Amino acid sequence: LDWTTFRRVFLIDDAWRPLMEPELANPLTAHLLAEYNRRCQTEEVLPPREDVFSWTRYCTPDEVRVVIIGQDPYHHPGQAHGLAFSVRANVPPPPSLRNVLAAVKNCYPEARMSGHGCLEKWARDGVLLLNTTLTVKRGAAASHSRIGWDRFVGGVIRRLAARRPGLVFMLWGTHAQNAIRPDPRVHCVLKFSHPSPLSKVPFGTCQHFLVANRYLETRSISPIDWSV
């Protein structure tokens, strides 16, 4: 009833129903949804409605191997498409993303890199790219950061970790580290500074992609091909 409609509106893959449906019982979720609707009527909200929950379509909760946390979606038209860090195909990768891709290449000299910045391939292979804030007003960073998306996304991630022990989490920067705190005994929790070229430590030196694959391998899971 509430779910049937919710799914209708954002075109959510039913496989995610058990992790999300419980959020609909919280009166705060209705407040969040009404505020999002009001903002769509008065400002230019990004990404497009159909892309807000694109992350639910590429893999099921059971296929998730790695979780990478983002903060805010890109705020210029045509950049964001529902996944953290990723930009639409044919959009040159901005600075932070270039650093993430440089680190993949430093870890895997044999990886064939396309030069593009769309991470749909990773998503289909079980890499969940999730922002804590899912929408933004065009041209204004963090403009929708207080309407409650982080509360809803936090609930979904808690239920996932609870259901799936042995996940790899990649937490880059202070926000992601404060936002999510999975049990380090049950999951592989990896931390590093932010990919931004303004960080004191060069992100190109990050070895998370390599460490994650070694972890998966010690657990009989196939490694992720990080080329893109």
XYZ file of C-alpha atoms in Angstrom:
228
model
C 0.000 0.000 0.000
C 2.560 2.603 1.079
C 5.226 0.452 -0.598
C 3.275 -0.233 -3.685
C 3.035 3.468 -4.336
C 6.543 4.397 -3.178
C 7.978 1.921 -5.638
C 5.713 3.171 -8.387
C 6.976 6.760 -7.968
C 10.754 6.126 -7.828
C 10.805 2.875 -9.877
C 12.516 0.920 -7.113
C 13.567 -2.708 -7.728
C 11.372 -4.925 -5.526
C 14.456 -6.938 -4.418
C 15.190 -4.058 -2.028
C 11.704 -4.212 -0.466
C 12.786 -5.968 2.786
C 15.520 -3.352 3.571
C 13.372 -0.251 2.713
C 9.729 -1.036 3.465
C 10.323 -0.838 7.227
C 11.333 2.837 6.785
C 7.856 3.673 5.519
C 6.379 3.052 8.991
C 8.338 6.029 10.428
C 6.223 9.244 10.467
C 9.511 11.031 9.709
C 9.685 9.226 6.323
C 6.378 10.855 5.307
C 7.775 14.262 6.347
C 10.893 13.577 4.231
C 8.793 12.599 1.184
C 6.474 15.580 1.461
C 9.446 17.958 1.724
C 11.116 16.376 -1.311
C 7.849 16.838 -3.275
C 7.551 20.479 -2.221
C 11.124 21.156 -3.280
C 10.493 19.593 -6.718
C 7.638 22.071 -7.232
C 9.702 25.126 -6.370
C 13.321 24.483 -7.411
C 15.405 22.571 -9.898
C 16.131 19.296 -8.037
C 18.894 16.928 -9.124
C 19.226 14.102 -10.007
C 15.950 13.475 -11.948
C 13.229 11.577 -10.100
C 13.793 8.414 -12.140
C 17.506 8.379 -11.140
C 17.190 8.997 -7.383
C 17.028 5.282 -6.667
C 18.956 3.980 -9.661
C 21.307 2.263 -7.169
C 18.550 -0.346 -6.348
C 18.448 -1.578 -10.010
C 22.027 -2.713 -10.733
C 22.281 -5.462 -8.069
C 20.230 -7.035 -5.258
C 21.078 -6.796 -1.543
C 22.416 -10.340 -1.751
C 24.826 -9.477 -4.569
C 26.400 -6.495 -2.705
C 30.116 -7.046 -2.001
C 31.494 -3.515 -1.387
C 29.884 -0.326 -0.021
C 31.340 3.072 -0.886
C 29.783 6.085 0.881
C 29.390 9.512 -0.746
C 28.073 12.791 0.757
C 26.139 15.048 -1.668
C 25.149 14.419 -5.342
C 26.716 16.564 -8.106
C 24.807 19.835 -8.444
C 25.203 20.772 -12.115
C 22.811 19.482 -14.789
C 23.791 16.236 -16.468
C 26.389 15.117 -13.906
C 24.653 13.014 -11.209
C 22.679 9.873 -12.048
C 21.981 8.275 -8.680
C 25.313 6.670 -7.747
C 27.897 8.163 -5.436
C 30.978 9.668 -7.248
C 29.886 8.484 -10.733
C 29.036 10.857 -13.603
C 27.018 10.032 -16.738
C 28.944 8.449 -19.641
C 30.484 11.226 -21.847
C 30.821 13.662 -18.947
C 34.628 14.131 -18.382
C 35.400 13.033 -14.785
C 35.761 16.037 -12.431
C 38.880 16.296 -10.169
C 37.883 14.061 -7.202
C 36.732 11.252 -9.521
C 39.963 11.498 -11.573
C 41.829 10.762 -8.295
C 39.670 7.695 -7.527
C 40.372 6.381 -11.028
C 44.152 7.191 -10.710
C 44.288 5.074 -7.496
C 42.581 2.149 -9.291
C 45.317 2.344 -12.009
C 48.159 2.565 -9.424
C 46.777 -0.583 -7.718
C 46.188 -2.453 -10.985
C 48.734 -1.505 -13.726
C 47.070 -4.057 -16.028
C 43.533 -2.587 -15.682
C 42.215 -1.279 -18.997
C 40.762 2.143 -18.212
C 38.271 3.703 -20.612
C 38.930 7.303 -19.634
C 35.277 7.766 -18.709
C 33.739 8.273 -15.276
C 30.467 6.296 -15.300
C 30.601 3.519 -12.684
C 27.557 1.485 -13.798
C 29.910 -1.525 -14.424
C 31.028 -1.532 -10.763
C 27.362 -1.251 -9.611
C 26.313 -4.265 -11.670
C 29.250 -6.168 -10.152
C 28.171 -5.567 -6.547
C 29.795 -2.235 -5.623
C 27.081 -0.181 -3.875
C 27.758 3.570 -4.432
C 25.596 5.405 -1.948
C 25.337 9.091 -1.031
C 24.007 9.998 2.436
C 22.022 12.855 0.834
C 20.183 11.719 -2.367
C 19.014 15.044 -3.854
C 20.200 18.629 -4.191
C 18.990 21.949 -5.529
C 20.835 22.922 -8.687
C 23.946 25.000 -7.987
C 23.673 24.733 -4.208
C 25.774 22.183 -2.378
C 24.272 20.592 0.763
C 20.950 22.377 0.124
C 18.920 19.206 0.852
C 21.216 17.876 3.590
C 18.746 18.566 6.451
C 15.447 17.200 5.175
C 16.258 13.703 6.481
C 17.792 11.586 3.665
C 20.704 10.576 5.905
C 18.288 9.059 8.474
C 16.542 6.955 5.804
C 19.817 5.888 4.069
C 21.359 5.080 7.494
C 18.484 2.721 8.238
C 18.838 0.920 4.914
C 22.649 0.462 5.460
C 22.164 -0.813 9.043
C 19.686 -3.447 7.877
C 22.026 -4.489 5.047
C 25.090 -4.911 7.344
C 22.883 -6.816 9.803
C 21.766 -9.200 7.078
C 25.099 -9.507 5.285
C 28.192 -10.124 7.448
C 31.571 -9.777 5.740
C 30.869 -6.717 3.598
C 33.735 -4.410 2.641
C 33.135 -0.740 3.518
C 35.251 2.050 1.957
C 34.908 5.296 4.054
C 36.713 8.238 2.513
C 36.938 11.436 4.514
C 35.534 12.654 7.786
C 31.822 12.721 6.858
C 31.665 9.065 5.693
C 33.626 7.968 8.731
C 31.216 9.731 11.143
C 28.104 8.669 9.215
C 28.556 4.890 9.155
C 30.188 2.784 11.833
C 29.895 -0.938 10.972
C 31.236 -3.576 13.332
C 34.932 -4.007 12.332
C 34.950 -7.537 13.619
C 32.076 -8.622 11.403
C 32.981 -6.507 8.302
C 36.101 -5.232 6.596
C 36.009 -1.487 7.382
C 38.546 0.500 5.319
C 39.231 4.228 5.988
C 41.179 6.857 4.073
C 41.242 10.619 3.499
C 38.958 12.174 0.853
C 39.821 11.903 -2.902
C 39.735 15.689 -3.321
C 42.939 17.087 -4.825
C 42.904 19.521 -1.826
C 43.608 16.705 0.698
C 46.996 16.613 2.402
C 47.474 12.929 1.595
C 47.391 12.141 -2.191
C 44.466 9.805 -2.829
C 46.424 8.102 -5.656
C 48.279 6.293 -2.863
C 45.121 4.562 -1.584
C 45.224 0.773 -1.732
C 41.628 0.003 -0.769
C 40.822 -1.694 -4.112
C 43.641 -4.138 -3.602
C 42.946 -4.797 0.132
C 39.233 -5.390 -0.594
C 40.039 -8.085 -3.189
C 42.439 -9.879 -0.848
C 39.703 -9.892 1.828
C 37.074 -11.299 -0.560
C 39.546 -13.973 -1.668
C 40.200 -15.166 1.895
C 36.400 -15.725 1.952
C 35.974 -17.584 -1.376
C 34.272 -14.645 -3.142
C 35.421 -13.735 -6.669
C 37.445 -10.522 -6.820
C 36.019 -7.343 -8.353
C 37.497 -6.246 -11.691
C 38.045 -2.512 -10.979
C 38.671 -1.507 -14.614
C 36.200 1.011 -15.977
